[PDB]
Amino acid sequence: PSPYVGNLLNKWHDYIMQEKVHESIEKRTEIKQLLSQAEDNKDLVDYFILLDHRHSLCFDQEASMGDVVNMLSKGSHDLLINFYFELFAGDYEFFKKNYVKAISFYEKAEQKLSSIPNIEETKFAEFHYKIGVAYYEIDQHLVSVNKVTKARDIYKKSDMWNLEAIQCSLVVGINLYDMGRLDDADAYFRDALTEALDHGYDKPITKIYHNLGLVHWQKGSLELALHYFREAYSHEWLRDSPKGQQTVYMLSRVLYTMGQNEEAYHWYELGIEMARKFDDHEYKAKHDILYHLYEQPSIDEVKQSLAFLEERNLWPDVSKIAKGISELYEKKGDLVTSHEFLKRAFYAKEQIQRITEAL
C-alpha cells in the first residue's frame, strides 16, 4: 500500500535525526526497491531525494558535521522535508481511519504551502480534497463540502484534471446525501454523471449509479433505487472490489423491503460470500441483520448484530438501520420493540459527533 512506503520514508527521517546510520540505510534500500516499481507518486521520490540529501550531510562523505546546522541549505531542506513528513504522516493516519489526527497533520502541511517556491495550485487542491474527505468521514458535512468545492474549482480550470474534478463532485454528492439534502444530491450526481460519461471513466460512473441508488432509496422510490443499484453492479470491476459489498448489500436490503424475498436472499448469499472473501466483519453483521429480520426472525440476534455495529462506532449506519427496524415492527403492530429500536436509533444519532478518537 502507498501509505505504507510513505510511512517508511518517515521512519528513515526518524533514524537520521537519531544519528543511527545503520537503521537509516536499511530503510533507504527498502524504499528504493519499493520505489523502482515506478508505482506513480513522484512525491515519494522527491521526499526520497530530500532525505538522501540530508542522509549524506549527516553520515556519508562528510569529515566534519559540527557545521551542519549552520549550513545554508538546512533552512530550505527543513521546510520541504517537514512538509512531506507531515503530508505522509497524514496519509498513514487516514489509512488507519484516525481522521482527527490526519486532519491535524494535513493542516500542518497545508500552512507550509505558501512558503514553497514553485507549487502551483493543484497541490492546494489535493489538501483541500484530503482534508475535506477526512472531515466527511467524521460527519462534518458543511466544512467538507466547502473544502472539496474549493478543490473542484481548482481542478475545473484544466482539461488535464477532469477525473480529479469529477472525484471532487462525488464527495460533495455523498455529503449532501448524508445531510439529507436528497434533491440537491440527485441534481449534483446527474450533472457529475454526464461528464463522467463524456470521458468514459468506468470507476466514477459506477459510483454515481450506486449513490443515485442510495438517494432514491432514502427518498422512497424503491424501484428507481433498485434500477440504479443494478446499473452499478453491471460494471464488472465492482463485484471484485470490496466496495461492491455496499451495493450487493443494498440490493439485498432494497429487495427485502419490497416483496421480492427470493431474489433478495440471492444477493444475501452473495453478500455473505464476499464478506468472507474480504474478511469484512461489518458487512457480515449488516447481512445478519437482514437475515434475522426477513428470514428466520430473531429479535435478539438482530440486536447482537446491531451491538457489533455500535462497537465499531458506525453510528450513522446504526441510526438508520435501527430506525428502519423500528418502522417495520410498528407496521407489524408491535410497539414495544418498535419503540425500543427507535430509542436505539436516537441514541445512535447522539453518538455521531461524539468522535471516538482522542481529539
Binding site: 474527505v133 472525484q167 462525488l170 464527495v171 454528492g173 455523498i174 446525501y177 448524508d178 459510483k207 450506486h210 449513490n211 442510495l214 432509496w217 466496495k243 455496499q246 451495493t247 448489500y249 443494498m250 450513522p316 449506519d317 438508520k320
Partner: peptide, 5 residues
Amino acid sequence: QKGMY
C-alpha cells in the same frame, strides 16, 4: 448507509 466514493 453512507455513500461510496
